[PDB]
Amino acid sequence: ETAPDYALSMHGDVALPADYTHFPYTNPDAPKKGSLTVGVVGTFDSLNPFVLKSMRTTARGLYNDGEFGNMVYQTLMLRSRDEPFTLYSLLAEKVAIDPERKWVEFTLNPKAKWSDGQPVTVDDVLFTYDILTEKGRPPYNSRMSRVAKIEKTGERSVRFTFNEKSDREFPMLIAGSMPVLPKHAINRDTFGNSTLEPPIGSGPYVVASVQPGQRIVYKRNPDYWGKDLPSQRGFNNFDKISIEYYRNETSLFESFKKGILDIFIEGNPIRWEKLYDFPAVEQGKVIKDTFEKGTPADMLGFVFNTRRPIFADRRVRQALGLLFDFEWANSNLFAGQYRRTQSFWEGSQLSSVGRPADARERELLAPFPGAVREDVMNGTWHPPVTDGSGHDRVPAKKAYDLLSQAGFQFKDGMAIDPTAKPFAFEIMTRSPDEEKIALAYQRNLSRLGIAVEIHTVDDAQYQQRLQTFDYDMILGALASSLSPGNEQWLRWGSASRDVQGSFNFAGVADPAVDAMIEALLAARNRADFVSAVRALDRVLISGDYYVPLYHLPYQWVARWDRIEHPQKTPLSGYQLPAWWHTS
Ligand SMILES: [Cl-]
């Protein structure tokens, strides 16, 4: 009775009422003529995103695409990019669901059609779970291990009943992380092969041409079945989208400058600052756009391997963390473009930084009295801000005092560890960019008498060492989101510390961490969830497992002025599928 029939939200929060006319970040009257040409670094030679063969060389744009979403293969429900985790109607016109999430039932829209004009049916859905289970790659072949029964319940209705291996997130994955495939158009015996035959989907774009290693051209189907859905209003505005493939970023950038590519998505701060001094920018023909987003910025940090005795003591990790001089690095290496990262959910509502712990967090954390530092609990903690000099005496004195409390001596002019050895460790780096930042950190550590070796290892040997946790310190990245879930166990869970190949690079094993992961998974409403995640953040910060580095505070997209976008930018940042070509 309480469940909407037109939406499915992970934690029950649904921003749009049933009669919405469009997602709030689209222009409901966007022009519909003209093309978009974008570049990517890499290659492709196949057109099946759901199978092992050629999985690393599959064309962009078909399904699960970061910039373009699902242009050929569609899901039952469509994710809004203005909410943390809410899905709205797409192939499924209606949804019904068990309060306890033991079953979910979808009713297909009777207008739904494949691009060849055949109907999308319940039989296509059943076929989809059959063939992907038998012949798909992970994760697409793993869904049925959670499903007790899949059955047709009406002319256009299908119900999934789940088994005890399922969890509250699982129905979300059925609704939004599986395609629907066309039974009538797929040769089952060859499904799985590398293929360059244009595949049939229900999406708005068809594959018009394919030049392997070079270019895929999508054309809009004028008879696209979903064109009038409120969930599609102001999307799919380009009548043609070409994705071109380049061997490196410089080649790609040059092709943008020549007007062959319409946009350039920029992540390099030196390039953004220095290299957009070409005439088109000065004439206003190329616009440097910036956007903000409320999804978190991915963590980048130095990672302490807490398994090594040198780094077992959190007080030592805390001291060494204070010595990184971000303000010097930003100013001298990065043209001031970065902002300091402080939280594992940086820039989002899930960050604990600058927020006193709420009543729910304090309840959750009370059984773990040592787990969160007072400054972190009260929201007064931040990493040091230096004078930018590269030799600021203030964080260094705090570091010196902490190491002394932890048993260090200083005897000229070395830092001596509690076992009476001169303190020394290695930073394993993978690239010249990593070396450059490690070198900067090394200069500050050396000023306290600490000897640091920087050792660059090629990619394959680097991964061999990651696998066995064979390092003192590395640089580590995390793919963050507004919906942390089961993946948190392999990052931070105490069982993952001793599993070779896990993602727990710091070797975290703390019942408080485990308990906060349990709590965020148990949360059934967005308030409890936010509280639990913040509490996880507080514990992780208080362990000094990472020395958090930096992130870009704006998204950057340069564009020829023949490309436009809505004034509004949603929670997830810019959304290319809502952009259009000027008249
Ligand atoms: Cl995350």
TrEMBL record:
Q: In which domain of life is the source organism classified?
A: Bacteria
Record keywords: Periplasm, Signal, Transport
Give the CC-aspect GO terms.
ATP-binding cassette (ABC) transporter complex; outer membrane-bounded periplasmic space
Q: Name one GO biological process term.
A: microcin transport
Q: Where in the cell is it found?
A: Periplasm
Give the family, as the similarity comment puts it: Belongs to the bacterial solute-binding protein 5 family.
Q: What is this protein called?
A: Extracellular solute-binding protein family 5
Q: Which organism is it from?
A: Brucella melitensis biotype 2 (strain ATCC 23457)
